[PDB]
Every structure is written in structure tokens, then in C-alpha cells.
Amino acid sequence: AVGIGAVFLGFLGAAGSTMGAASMTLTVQARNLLSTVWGIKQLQARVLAVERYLRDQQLLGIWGCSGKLICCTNVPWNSSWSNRNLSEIWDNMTWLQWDKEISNYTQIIYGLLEESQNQQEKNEQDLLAL
Amino acid sequence: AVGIGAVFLGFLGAAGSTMGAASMTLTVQARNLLSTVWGIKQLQARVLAVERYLRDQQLLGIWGCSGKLICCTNVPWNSSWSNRNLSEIWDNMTWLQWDKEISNYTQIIYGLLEESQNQQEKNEQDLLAL
Amino acid sequence: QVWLRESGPGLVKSSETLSLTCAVSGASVGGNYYWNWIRQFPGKGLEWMGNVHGGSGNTEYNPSLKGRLTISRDTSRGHFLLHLDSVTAADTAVYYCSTQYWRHTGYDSSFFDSWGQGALVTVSS
Amino acid sequence: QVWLRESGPGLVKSSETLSLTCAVSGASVGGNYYWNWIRQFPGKGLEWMGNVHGGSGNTEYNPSLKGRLTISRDTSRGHFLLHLDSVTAADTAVYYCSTQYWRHTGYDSSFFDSWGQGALVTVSS
Amino acid sequence: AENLWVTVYYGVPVWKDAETTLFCASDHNVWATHACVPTDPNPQEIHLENVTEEFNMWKNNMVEQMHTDIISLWDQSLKPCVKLTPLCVTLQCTNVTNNITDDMRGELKNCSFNMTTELRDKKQKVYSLFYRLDVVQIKEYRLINCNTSACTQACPKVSFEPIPIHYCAPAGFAILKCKDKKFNGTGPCPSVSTVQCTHGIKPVVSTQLLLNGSLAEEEVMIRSENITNNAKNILVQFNTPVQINCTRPNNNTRKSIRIGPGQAFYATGDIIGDIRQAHCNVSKATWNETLGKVVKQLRKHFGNNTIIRFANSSGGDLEVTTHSFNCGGEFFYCNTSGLFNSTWISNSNDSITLPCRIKQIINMWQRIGQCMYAPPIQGVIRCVSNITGLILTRDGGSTNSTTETFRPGGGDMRDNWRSELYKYKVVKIEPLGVAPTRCKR
Amino acid sequence: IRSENITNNAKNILVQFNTPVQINCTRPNNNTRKSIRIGPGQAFYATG
Numbered sequence: 001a002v003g004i005g006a007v008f009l010g011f012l013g014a015a016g017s018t019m020g021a022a023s024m025t026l027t028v029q030a031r032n033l034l035s036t037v038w039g040i041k042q043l044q045a046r047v048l049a050v051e052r053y054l055r056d057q058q059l060l061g062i063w064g065c066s067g068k069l070i071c072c073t074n075v076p077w078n079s080s081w082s083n084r085n086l087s088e089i090w091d092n093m094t095w096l097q098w099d100k101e102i103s104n105y106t107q108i109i110y111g112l113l114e115e116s117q118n119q120q121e122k123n124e125q126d127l128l129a130l
Numbered sequence: 131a132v133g134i135g136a137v138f139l140g141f142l143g144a145a146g147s148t149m150g151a152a153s154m155t156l157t158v159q160a161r162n163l164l165s166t167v168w169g170i171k172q173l174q175a176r177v178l179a180v181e182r183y184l185r186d187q188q189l190l191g192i193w194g195c196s197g198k199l200i201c202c203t204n205v206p207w208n209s210s211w212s213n214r215n216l217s218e219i220w221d222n223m224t225w226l227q228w229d230k231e232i233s234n235y236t237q238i239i240y241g242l243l244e245e246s247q248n249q250q251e252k253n254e255q256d257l258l259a260l
Numbered sequence: 261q262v263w264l265r266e267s268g269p270g271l272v273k274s275s276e277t278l279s280l281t282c283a284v285s286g287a288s289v290g291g292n293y294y295w296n297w298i299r300q301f302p303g304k305g306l307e308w309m310g311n312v313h314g315g316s317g318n319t320e321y322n323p324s325l326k327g328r329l330t331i332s333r334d335t336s337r338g339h340f341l342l343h344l345d346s347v348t349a350a351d352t353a354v355y356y357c358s359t360q361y362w363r364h365t366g367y368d369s370s371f372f373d374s375w376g377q378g379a380l381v382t383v384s385s
Numbered sequence: 386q387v388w389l390r391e392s393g394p395g396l397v398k399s400s401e402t403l404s405l406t407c408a409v410s411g412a413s414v415g416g417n418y419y420w421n422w423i424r425q426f427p428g429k430g431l432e433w434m435g436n437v438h439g440g441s442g443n444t445e446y447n448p449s450l451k452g453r454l455t456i457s458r459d460t461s462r463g464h465f466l467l468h469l470d471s472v473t474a475a476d477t478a479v480y481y482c483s484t485q486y487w488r489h490t491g492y493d494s495s496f497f498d499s500w501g502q503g504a505l506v507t508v509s510s
Numbered sequence: 511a512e513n514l515w516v517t518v519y520y521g522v523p524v525w526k527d528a529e530t531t532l533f534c535a536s537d538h539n540v541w542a543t544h545a546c547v548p549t550d551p552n553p554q555e556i557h558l559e560n561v562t563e564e565f566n567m568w569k570n571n572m573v574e575q576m577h578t579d580i581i582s583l584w585d586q587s588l589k590p591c592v593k594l595t596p597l598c599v600t601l602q603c604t605n606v607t608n609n610i611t612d613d614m615r616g617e618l619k620n621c622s623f624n625m626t627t628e629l630r631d632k633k634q635k636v637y638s639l640f641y642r643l644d645v646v647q648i649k650e651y652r653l654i655n656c657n658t659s660a661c662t663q664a665c666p667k668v669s670f671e672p673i674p675i676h677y678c679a680p681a682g683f684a685i686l687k688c689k690d691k692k693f694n695g696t697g698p699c700p701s702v703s704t705v706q707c708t709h710g711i712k713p714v715v716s717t718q719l720l721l722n723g724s725l726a727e728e729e730v731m732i733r734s735e736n737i738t739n740n741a742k743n744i745l746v747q748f749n750t751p752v753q754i755n756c757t758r759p760n761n762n763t764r765k766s767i768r769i770g771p772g773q774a775f776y777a778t779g780d781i782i783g784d785i786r787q788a789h790c791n792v793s794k795a796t797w798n799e800t801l802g803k804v805v806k807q808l809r810k811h812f813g814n815n816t817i818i819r820f821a822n823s824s825g826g827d828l829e830v831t832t833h834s835f836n837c838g839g840e841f842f843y844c845n846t847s848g849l850f851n852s853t854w855i856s857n858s859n860d861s862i863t864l865p866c867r868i869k870q871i872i873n874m875w876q877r878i879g880q881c882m883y884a885p886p887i888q889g890v891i892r893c894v895s896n897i898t899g900l901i902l903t904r905d906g907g908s909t910n911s912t913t914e915t916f917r918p919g920g921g922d923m924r925d926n927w928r929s930e931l932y933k934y935k936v937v938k939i940e941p942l943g944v945a946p947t948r949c950k951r
Numbered sequence: 952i953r954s955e956n957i958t959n960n961a962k963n964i965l966v967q968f969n970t971p972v973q974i975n976c977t978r979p980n981n982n983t984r985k986s987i988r989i990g991p992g993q994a995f996y997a998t999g
């Protein structure tokens with residue numbers, strides 16, 4: 001039960017694996033996100049698919065991780081959000097469980113990321129002024 | 131016949147020149163890619179134009195070449211795809227001819243680029259972990 | 261319009277290396293241009309010396325001047341330099357930097373040629 | 386709410402340079418804030434010493450303390466420092482760091498004032 | 511000590527329940543496949559390992575969407591067809607009494623009337639054959655729908671044959687399919703896959719019996735939202751079909767009457783030969799075996815010592831009281847009374863014949879003010895179909911008795927769609943995620 | 952009081968009160984409505 005390798009090349013094949021194993025197949029999921037009674041439905045579907053992708057891209061770009069699939073930042077991990085160790089998260093849990101556990105504290109992290117990115121940009125401009 | 135300069139500023143003026151000469155006017159082509167019987171046609175045209183541009187931008191960004199017009203990568207050039215020298219490509223051929231010749235081996239290069247970019251991102255994260 | 265200005269020392273001792281500069285204004289040295297170095301001896305005809313391509317960087321030299329003539333570019337500073345080794349008394353002349361190119365703007369195409377005022381170089385000990 | 390805490394040495398010898406620090410919590414030093422350094426002499430009234438703007442960095446000093454008083458910021462460490470050269474026995478006092486600002490939260494507007502507990506500095510050999 | 515920092519991952523495999531709009535995929539029809547996208551020759555299905563999902567057939571939103579699209583297509587297909595406004599004229603009817611048996615006596619009316627022509631100042635005298643269910647006395651009769659609303663005639667070129675349809679979701683959404691057998695449509699499904707979109711589903715419209723459906727792979731399956739409550743219909747799915755052969759043997763004749771410029775009404779000319787009622791045949795031993803399996807599976811939820819009764823319908827309209835369908839363009843309504851008639855107590859080549867009727871004025875969906883006049887079909891018609899389930903209802907059920915009586919049900923057509931879309935659901939992906947890590951920008 | 956060009960007589964003047972003025976309107980006839988069927992599923996409502 002230990003010392004076995006698992007590799008997935010499907011769309012959502014890694015949905016049932018651990019976070020660490022599932023973090024190696026992000027591109028396969030990234031590709032798919034973009035792509036008279038029935039024509040209007042098709043048009044609305046296309047518009048909605050474009051809108052959601054554009055919203056996600058804008059949100060990613062605001063934090064400074066534009067054009068990246070893995071990007072760590074300057075914001076420290078507040079211990080109030082979670083208390084487990086890295087050994088029990090990346091090797092003892094799945095992404096779905098983590099999302100279910102952390103969904104209460106999502107917006108605060110987003111605001112902190114935006115503020116930190118703005119401060120970093122201002123500091124970079126000040127440094128380049130010299 | 132030798133020792134004469136040529137500069138173009140039209141939309142597709144450099145279509146008939148060589149690859150090296152045509153690689154100096156990429157921005158002029160980049161600008162134009164985005165911009166009852168007739169209104170629906172106009173709406174469909176707008177939607178299609180948006181979708182194609184978004185697909186192209188996503189494909190460029192997946193490889194790590196986001197926000198760049200001349201982005202060179204780490205994947206080596208397999209000799210099976212082509213056998214000519216740089217002197218006979220960039221000074222003896224046109225982009226249309228090169229595309230007609232190399233249309234056969236595009237998806238393999240795309241997949242290799244995606245995998246290389248993912249590996250580079252993971253290696254960068256590992257290096258930044260220390 | 262492309263403006264070319266020559267510069268360099270007015271005198272070079274025999275057997276030394278003559279260095280000349282040509283500065284370009286109104287155009288980018290890194291564009292699809294050919295920059296040519298020519299000279300005129302006193303009381304004689306012209307004699308093309310060499311040229312360089314701004315984009316690729318390939319240089320073409322006269323066979324007579326081969327082995328002693330070098331032409332280089334500088335995109336950041338926007339000028340191109342010329343070097344001639346083992347200059348003798350016969351190398352005294354007026355040097356010019358020129359460029360000819362076709363400009364195809366939309367519907368219409370034109371031929372433009374630009375020359376510099378030139379710099380007199382005298383070789384003697 | 387913006388919290389300010391003073392810190393620094395409790396004693397400075399005469400003719401030395403007094404260095405003081407004020408740390409800010411709950412707000413960014415690089416924001417659109419004015420940070421003011423004031424002092425109170427023993428058994429006397431208050432005396433504003435200087436201030437600095439977090440964003441642009443312009444500093445305004447009292448004419449009496451001009452030529453010896455410096456105020457600087459530190460956004461990365463989130464605190465601002467004060468330097469006073471040639472401190473004499475008359476410079477013994479309690480130093481405070483304060484800030485005033487209008488907060489315009491959409492519809493509403495409110496004036497906010499913040500002071501620190503202050504640090505006593507005694508100058509003597 | 512911990513020194514952990516937030517890290518953003520894009521492309522995480524996480525999904526959430528959502529409601530969206532699906533579109534066509536399919537390989538002269540009322541269910542127009544012309545505006546439906548072509549289907550890929552080789553559909554892609556990705557099984558998800560160690561993934562258990564939550565499923566509920568009774569709250570699926572795809573059923574409502576399918577119902578709305580079916581109704582919209584049905585309404586759209588009838589727009590370019592003749593309107594039978596002139597047909598609301600007083601009729602003079604007599605009895606058809608030649609070569610008629612003892613059961614078809616008085617079931618047909620020979621009605622003569624006046625009608626318009628292409629010229630707007632000339633009239634013609636015509637006659638036709640009508641069914642007794644279509645005419646109401648005012649020796650003078652009139653069509654039943656004349657005091658409610660004028661209504662159209664189905665165009666004779668569009669076919670009512672069902673065609674399979676696949677319902678596919680947009681980008682950013684996924685269709686999850688429960689591959690676990692013996693799943694009763696509610697609760698946790700442990701075996702799950704993601705499919706590009708669903709398989710072909712025929713929009714077969716019928717009541718009191720499910721025809722040309724899908725069979726259970728293990729055994730007879732009984733489903734109900736709340737089996738304790740007697741107000742919820744019970745859905746039964748057979749693991750093997752039961753063949754049924756329906757036929758109208760009358761040799762009909764069709765004639766055309768020009769009622770205006772480029773407008774024709776298709777009437778029944780005459781019947782050539784004998785006149786006999788349409789009927790359906792179903793095997794007896796197969797039905798008995800199927801009922802044995804059904805009662806065996808029913809005993810699980812209602813005790814192992816109860817007495818199980820199958821009886822007749824309660825009453826109401828002819829659409830809900832009778833197995834109603836269409837076979838070859840003619841709308842049959844039939845009396846499934848010889849089937850659900852038996853009692854079971856805990857402990858050969860003949861067949862059951864259902865005699866039954868045909869109708870021409872149709873109120874297809876449960877609406878008021880819109881008909882559909884089916885033009886007559888020429889010649890004898892016969893069809894064969896499968897029976898692959900039942901819709902039952904428990905009458906009474908109080909504790910005062912120790913026996914259960916089940917009667918056939920129907921009426922609502924959503925239950926016909928619910929029997930096929932029970933193993934599917936739609937979710938939307940949420941790629942963005944935040945985790946704790948060590949690397950610092 | 953508002954107007955595009957008060958000097959010109961061809962432009963209407965808009966007046967806005969600071970307080971309302973109550974107005975009570977009434978029709979006191981006791982009318983009767985009767986439906987007449989003029990076709991299949993078509994009724995015309997006349998005053999009886």
C-alpha cells in the first residue's frame with residue numbers, strides 16, 4: 001500500500017487523489033476552461049463561458065500571479081484559518097475537502113493579496129525612481 | 131539586387147518578404163486581430179472575433195510566453211521536423227512556405243512546450259521554497 | 261528622412277588603426293536597413309568600402325579591403341562603426357556613410373537614398 | 386484604528402544624536418497619511434517638532450529645529466524614525482508620534498486622531 | 511516556527527452544484543435535429559477513482575429543461591400549417607351501419623356539411639367520417655373544440671417518430687454520471703464518471719406504461735420520492751422488456767378538399783371492406799412472470815407477509831384513465847384493465863387482448879385552447895413495442911387494513927423524462943484555490 | 952420653474968410644486984359587463 005506511483009492524464013482524473021499528487025496536472029484542467037430554439041442557447045452558453053474565464057483571469061492578474069499556474073506570495077498564513085501541518089494536508093487530504101474546509105475565509109485572503117500587490121508595485125516604482 | 135533595404139508599414143505588406151524581414155512588423159498584425167438581418171450577423175461576428183483572440187491568448191499564456199511577441203523557449207529543435215540551416219530559412223523563405231512545410235508537426239511541439247513550462251514552474255517553486 | 265553624420269579623428273599615423281563613426285537620426289539601426297561605407301580619394305573617383313545589415317548583422321567587404329576592414333553596429337547607441345587596420349599614406353580620403361532603401365507605405369512605394377556630409381581623414385606620420 | 390508605539394534609548398549624552406522610532410500598526414506607512422513628531426518639555430506646554438508624508442516623502446520641520454532635525458520613513462518595516470543632532474540639556478522631554486486623517490468611507494466621512502503613549506528622553510552627561 | 515504563506519493554484523479539480531442551459535448533440539421531424547449540433551463519433555468518458563458524489567433524481571433541473579424544450583419544439587413545428595377555422599360549421603350526421611361488428615356499433619358518424627372553396631363567393635357540399643369522440647350533438651352535430659378555440663391541423667409531411675437527443679453542457683461545466691448499479695436515484699453514489707454529454711434519449715410520450723425505454727441491468731428497480739407517503743407515484747423499471755403488438759386493421763381512405771387558396775383539408779373518404787376495432791396484444795406468461803418479479807421486489811418495502819392487489823384505475827379523463835400513445839400517426843387510447851387485475855398472497859400461447867379506440871382531435875400537453883387535428887392515415891397500421899416499466903400509485907394505505915392495492919397512474923409527462931435522466935447531474939468547475947506553503951515571493 | 956429658453960414663447964414651462972394638491976375623481980354609474988361570444992374562444996365585453 002506504500003511505494004506505488006500514480007499518474008493521471010484525464011480531464012478530472014486526479015479529483016480523487018491527494019493535493020500533492022493532484023497539483024501536477026493543472027494544465028489539463030486549464031485547457032478545457034475556455035473550450036432557432038438551440039442557437040440562442042448556444043450563444044448564451046458561449047457568452048457565459050467567456051465571461052467566467054475573463055473574470056478568473058482578471059482576479060488572477062490583480063494579485064500579481066498573472067500568467068502563472070503556481071505562485072506563492074508575501075502574505076503570511078494566519079493560524080486562525082487552519083491549524084494542520086503540511087504533512088497532513090498535502091499527503092492526507094483532497095482538494096475538494098480542503099475547499100469545503102476553507103470556504104468560510106476566502107474573501108479576506110483576496111483583499112490582503114490585492115493590497116500587498118499594490119504596495120509591492122508602489123515600492124518597486126519608488127526603488128526604480130532612484 | 132543586393133544591398134537594398136525594404137521597410138513595410140501596411141497590414142499585410144510583409145507577406146511577400148522573407149521571414150527575417152517579416153519578423154520586424156509583428157505589432158501591425160497584432161493590432162488588427164481584435165478590431166434585423168444585419169444585427170445578428172454583427173453580433174455573431176463580434177462573438178467569434180472575441181473567442182478566437184481569447185483562445186490564441188490562452189494558448190500563448192500556457193507556454194509562459196504571455197505578454198511577449200518574440201518568446202523563445204527551452205525545447206530543443208528535433209532534427210526530424212526540419213533539416214535546413216538558418217541561412218536558408220530566415221533569408222531564403224517566407225512565412226507562408228514555412229507554415230505549409232511545418233503544419234504536420236505542430237501539436238507535438240505544443241504539448242512539449244506545455245510540459246516544459248509546467249516543469250519549469252514546479253522547479254521555480256521548489257527553488258523558492260528554500 | 262534618415263540623417264547620417266560622420267565623426268572621427270582628423271589625422272591617423274601610418275600603420276595605426278583608423279576608427280570612424282556614423283550616427284543615424286530618424287531611423288533605427290536595428291531595422292531592415294543596409295548601411296554602406298564608401299570613400300573618395302583626393303582627385304579621383306569613388307570606391308565603395310563595405311556595408312552591414314542592421315537586422316541580421318551580416319557584413320560584406322570589398323575584396324581589396326578584406327582582412328583589414330571591419331564594420332560593426334550599435335543599436336543601443338544607434339550608430340555604426342568602421343575600423344581599418346594598417347592605414348598607409350594611400351588611405352587618405354573623404355569617408356561617407358550612406359543608405360538606400362525602398363519604403364512601401366500602403367498603396368505607394370518610394371526609393372529613398374541618404375548620404376552624410378563626410379569626414380576627411382589624412383594618413384601620415 | 387491606527388496604533389502608534391514609541392521606542393528608543395532612555396538616556397542620551399549631551400552633544401550626541403538622539404534617535405527615536407515610532408511603529409505603526411493597523412495601517413500602511415506608505416499610504417496617504419501624515420506622521421507628526423511632537424514633544425512636551427517637563428512642566429511646560431507642547432511643541433510640535435516636525436512631520437512627514439508617507440506617500441510622497443516630503444518632510445516639514447519647525448524653523449527652530451531646522452538644521453538638526455530629520456524625519457524618515459520605512460515602509461518595509463512599517464515605522465518612521467526621528468534624528469536630532471547636538472542634543473543639549475534643554476532637549477529633555479516626552480516625545481510623542483501622532484497622526485490625523487479624514488476617512489471617507491463612501492457615503493460617510495469621519496475624522497480620526499491617533500497618539501502614542503510617548504517616550505521620556507533625558508539629555509545629560 | 512511554521513512560517514507558512516498563502517500560495518495560489520490555478521486549475522484545481524474542484525466542482526460545485528449549479529444550474530445552467532444545455533444544448534443539442536445528435537447524429538421532417540417534430541423534434542428538429544437540423545439546428546442540433548452533430549455528435550462526435552467516439553464520445554469520451556473519464557471514470558473518477560475514489561470519488562463518491564451525491565445524487566437526487568427528484569430534484570433534477572434537467573427534467574424541467576427537457577420538458578420546456580420539448581414543448582417549445584412542438585409549438586414551433588406547428589406554426590406553418592393550415593388553420594381549420596372554417597371547419598366550425600353545423601354538421602348533419604348519420605350512423606355508419608355496413609359491415610360493422612357488434613362492438614363498433616355507433617362508433618362512427620357519416621357527416622355531411624357545407625364548405626368554402628378557392629373563390630370567396632362559391633360553396634360546396636362535402637361529407638366525411640368522424641369518430642364519436644370528436645362530435646357532440648347541438649341529427650345535428652358539431653366539433654367538440656368549436657366552443658373552446660379554433661385550432662390547427664398537423665402538416666402531413668412532418669413525422670412524429672421519436673429521434674434520440676443528447677443534452678450537452680457548455681465549457682466550464684461537466685456532466686457527472688453514476689455508474690453504480692442497484693442505485694435508487696437518491697443518496698451517495700460511489701462509482702462516478704465524467705461524460706462529454708448524455709446518450710440518446712427518445713422523447714417517447716405515453717401514459718400508464720413506459721415504452722421503448724431503458725432496462726435495468728440487475729433486476730426490477732422500484733423508486734419513489736417517499737414510499738411511506740401514498741401521494742407519490744412509484745416508478746418501476748423492468749430488467750427485461752415485454753413485447754406488445756398494437757394494430758388498427760381498418761383500410762382507411764384519405765381525400766383532399768380545397769378550402770381556400772393553397773389550403774387543403776384531409777378527410778376520411780370511406781373504409782374498404784370490414785370495419786373492426788383496433789386492439790393490442792400482450793403475452794400472458796411473460797406478464798405473469800413480470801408481475802411475479804414486481805411483487806417480489808415490492809414485498810421488500812411493505813413487509814414479507816402482506817397481500818398485494820393489482821386493480822383498475824380510479825377515474826377521470828380518458829387521457830389519464832387509459833394508456834394513451836401514438837403509433838404510426840394515429841392516436842390510440844387503450845384500456846389496460848385486463849393487466850392490473852389480480853391478487854397475490856404471501857406463501858400457454860394465448861395472449862391478453864386490449865380492445866381500444868382512436869382519436870383525431872388532440873390536446874397533447876395538459877393545456878387548454880390548442881388542439882392538433884391528426885390527418886387520417888391510409889391503410890392498415892401495425893406496430894410492435896417494448897414495455898420496460900410502470901407508473902403505479904398506492905390507493906389508501908391506512909393501517910386499518912393489512913393489504914396493499916396498486917393502481918396504474920400517469921398524467922404528468924415529466925416522469926417519462928425522469929426515468930432516463932436519473933443517473934446524470936451537472937456541475938461547474940472552480941479552478942482557483944489557495945493553500946499554505948513555504949516559498950515566499 | 953424650468954424652461955429651455957424662457958424668453959421664447961415656443962418652449963413649454965415645467966412647474967414643480969413643493970407640496971401636493973389632492974384631487975378626487977369618480978365615475979358613479981353602476982355599470983354592468985356582459986360577454987358575447989363572437990367566435991371560437993373569442994369574447995367581446997359589452998356594457999349590459
Ligand SMILES: *[C@@H]1O[C@H](CO)[C@@H](O[C@@H]2O[C@H](CO)[C@@H](O[C@@H]3O[C@H](CO)[C@@H](O)[C@H](O[C@H]4O[C@H](CO)[C@@H](O)[C@H](O)[C@@H]4O[C@H]4O[C@H](CO)[C@@H](O)[C@H](O)[C@@H]4O)[C@@H]3O)[C@H](O)[C@H]2NC(C)=O)[C@H](O)[C@H]1NC(C)=O
Nearest residue numbers: 669671714721722835836837838887888889892893894895
Ligand atoms: C418503439 O420502437 C419501434 C421500433 O423501434 C416503433 O415501431 C416502428 O414504428 C415506425 C413508425 O411507425 C415504423 O416505420 C414505419 O413503417 C411503415 C411500414 O413499413 C412505413 O410505411 C412508414 O413510412 C411511412 O411514414 C413515413 C413517416 O413516418 C413516411 O416518410 C413514409 O413515406 C411512409 O409514408 C408513406 O405512406 C403513407 C401510407 O401509405 C402515406 O400516407 C404517406 O403520404 C407516404 O406516402 C414508417 O417507415 C417501423 O416499421 C416500426 N418498427 C417495427 C419493428 O414495427 C414503435 O412505434 C415505437 N413505439 C412508440 C410508442 O413510438
Ligand SMILES: *[C@@H]1O[C@H](CO)[C@@H](O[C@@H]2O[C@H](CO)[C@@H](O)[C@H](O)[C@H]2NC(C)=O)[C@H](O)[C@H]1NC(C)=O
Nearest residue numbers: 605606607608620621622637638639779780781
Ligand atoms: C356516407 O354518406 C354518403 C352520402 O350519403 C355516401 O355516399 C353515397 O353513396 C351511395 C352509395 O350507397 C351513392 O349512391 C351516393 O351517390 C353517394 N353520395 C354522394 C354524395 O357521393 C357514403 O357511401 C356514406 N359512407 C358510409 C361509410 O356510410
Ligand SMILES: *[C@@H]1O[C@H](CO)[C@@H](O[C@@H]2O[C@H](CO)[C@@H](O)[C@H](O)[C@H]2NC(C)=O)[C@H](O)[C@H]1NC(C)=O
Nearest residue numbers: 600601602603621622623624625633634635636
Ligand atoms: C348547405 O347549404 C344549403 C343552402 O345553401 C342548405 O339547404 C338549405 O337548408 C335550409 C335548412 O336550414 C333550408 O331552409 C333551405 O331551403 C335549403 N336550401 C336549399 C337550396 O336547399 C343545406 O342544408 C346545407 N347543408 C348542410 C349539410 O347543412
Ligand SMILES: *[C@@H]1O[C@H](CO)[C@@H](O[C@@H]2O[C@H](CO)[C@@H](O)[C@H](O)[C@H]2NC(C)=O)[C@H](O)[C@H]1NC(C)=O
Nearest residue numbers: 721722723725749750751752753894895896897
Ligand atoms: C426491445 O428489447 C429488445 C431486447 O432488449 C431489443 O433488442 C435489442 O436491440 C439492440 C439494439 O441496439 C441489440 O443490440 C440487441 O442485440 C437486441 N437484443 C436481442 C436479444 O436481440 C429491441 O431493440 C427493443 N425494441 C425497441 C423498439 O427498442
Ligand SMILES: *[C@@H]1O[C@H](CO)[C@@H](O[C@@H]2O[C@H](CO)[C@@H](O)[C@H](O)[C@H]2NC(C)=O)[C@H](O)[C@H]1NC(C)=O
Nearest residue numbers: 696734735736737738739740741742907908909
Ligand atoms: C413521508 O411521508 C410521511 C407521511 O406523510 C411523512 O410523515 C408525516 O409527516 C408529517 C409532517 O409533520 C406529519 O404531520 C404526519 O403525521 C406524518 N405521518 C406519518 C405516517 O409519519 C414523512 O415525514 C415523509 N418523509 C419525509 C422524508 O418527508
Ligand SMILES: *[C@@H]1O[C@H](CO)[C@@H](O[C@@H]2O[C@H](CO)[C@@H](O)[C@H](O)[C@H]2NC(C)=O)[C@H](O)[C@H]1NC(C)=O
Nearest residue numbers: 755756757758789790791792861862863892893
Ligand atoms: C391479436 O390476437 C388476436 C387473437 O386473440 C388475433 O386475432 C387473430 O388474427 C389472425 C390474423 O392473422 C386471424 O387469422 C385470426 O382469425 C384471428 N383470431 C381471432 C379469434 O380473432 C389478432 O390478429 C392479433 N393481433 C395482433 C396485432 O397481433
Ligand SMILES: *[C@@H]1O[C@H](CO)[C@@H](O[C@@H]2O[C@H](CO)[C@@H](O)[C@H](O)[C@H]2NC(C)=O)[C@H](O)[C@H]1NC(C)=O
Nearest residue numbers: 753754755756791792793794860861862893894
Ligand atoms: C408480436 O409480433 C411479433 C412479430 O410479428 C411476434 O413474434 C413472432 O411470433 C411468431 C409466433 O411465435 C413467430 O413465428 C415469429 O418468428 C416471431 N417473429 C419474430 C420477429 O420474433 C410476437 O409473437 C407477437 N407477440 C404477441 C404477444 O402477439
Ligand SMILES: *[C@@H]1O[C@H](CO)[C@@H](O[C@@H]2O[C@H](CO)[C@@H](O)[C@H](O)[C@H]2NC(C)=O)[C@H](O)[C@H]1NC(C)=O
Nearest residue numbers: 821822823824825826831832845846847848851
Ligand atoms: C375497472 O373495472 C371495473 C369493474 O370491472 C369497472 O367498473 C365498471 O364501469 C362501467 C363503466 O364503464 C360500469 O358500466 C360497470 O357497471 C362497472 N362495473 C361494476 C362491477 O360496477 C371500471 O370501469 C374499470 N375501469 C376502467 C378505467 O374502465
Ligand SMILES: *[C@@H]1O[C@H](CO)[C@@H](O[C@@H]2O[C@H](CO)[C@@H](O)[C@H](O)[C@H]2NC(C)=O)[C@H](O)[C@H]1NC(C)=O
Nearest residue numbers: 822828831832844845846847848849851864865
Ligand atoms: C375496460 O375493460 C373492462 C373489462 O371488460 C370494462 O369493464 C366492463 O364494462 C362493461 C360496460 O361497458 C360492463 O358491461 C362489463 O360488465 C365490465 N366488465 C367487468 C368484468 O366488470 C370497462 O368498462 C372498460 N373500460 C371502459 C372505459 O369501458
Ligand SMILES: *[C@@H]1O[C@H](CO)[C@@H](O[C@@H]2O[C@H](CO)[C@@H](O)[C@H](O)[C@H]2NC(C)=O)[C@H](O)[C@H]1NC(C)=O
Nearest residue numbers: 953954955956957958959960961962963964965
Ligand atoms: C431664446 O429665444 C430668443 C427669442 O427667439 C432668441 O433670440 C432670438 O434669436 C434669433 C436667432 O437669430 C433672432 O433671429 C431673434 O431676433 C432673437 N429674438 C430676440 C427677441 O432676441 C434667443 O437667442 C434664444 N436663446 C438662445 C440661447 O438661443
Ligand SMILES: *[C@@H]1O[C@H](CO)[C@@H](O[C@@H]2O[C@H](CO)[C@@H](O)[C@H](O)[C@H]2NC(C)=O)[C@H](O)[C@H]1NC(C)=O
Nearest residue numbers: 970971972973974975976977978979980981982
Ligand atoms: C365632489 O363634491 C361634490 C360637492 O360639490 C359632492 O357632491 C355630494 O356628494 C355627496 C356624496 O356623499 C352627496 O351626499 C351630496 O348630496 C352631494 N352634493 C351635491 C351638491 O352634489 C361629490 O360627491 C364629490 N365627489 C367626489 C368624488 O369627491
Ligand SMILES: *[C@@H]1O[C@H](CO)[C@@H](O)[C@H](O)[C@H]1NC(C)=O
Nearest residue numbers: 001016017094559560561562
Ligand atoms: C481513497 O480515498 C480515501 C478518502 O477519500 C482514503 O482514505 C484512501 O486512502 C484512498 N485510497 C487509497 C488506495 O489511497
Ligand SMILES: *[C@@H]1O[C@H](CO)[C@@H](O)[C@H](O)[C@H]1NC(C)=O
Nearest residue numbers: 603604605606615616617649
Ligand atoms: C346511432 O347508433 C347509436 C348507437 O346504437 C344510437 O344511440 C343512435 O341513436 C343512432 N342514431 C341514429 C339511428 O340516428
Ligand SMILES: *[C@@H]1O[C@H](CO)[C@@H](O)[C@H](O)[C@H]1NC(C)=O
Nearest residue numbers: 646654655656657658659992
Ligand atoms: C363546450 O361544450 C362542452 C359540452 O357542451 C362543455 O363541457 C364545455 O364546458 C364547453 N366549453 C366551455 C369553455 O364552456
Ligand SMILES: *[C@@H]1O[C@H](CO)[C@@H](O)[C@H](O)[C@H]1NC(C)=O
Nearest residue numbers: 692693694695696697698699
Ligand atoms: C434508497 O433510497 C433511500 C431513500 O431514503 C436512501 O436512504 C437509500 O440510501 C437508497 N439506497 C441506496 C443504496 O443508496
Ligand SMILES: *[C@@H]1O[C@H](CO)[C@@H](O)[C@H](O)[C@H]1NC(C)=O
Nearest residue numbers: 760761762782783888889890
Ligand atoms: C386496402 O385497399 C386498397 C385499395 O383496394 C388495397 O390496394 C390494399 O391492398 C388494401 N389493404 C390491404 C391490407 O389489403
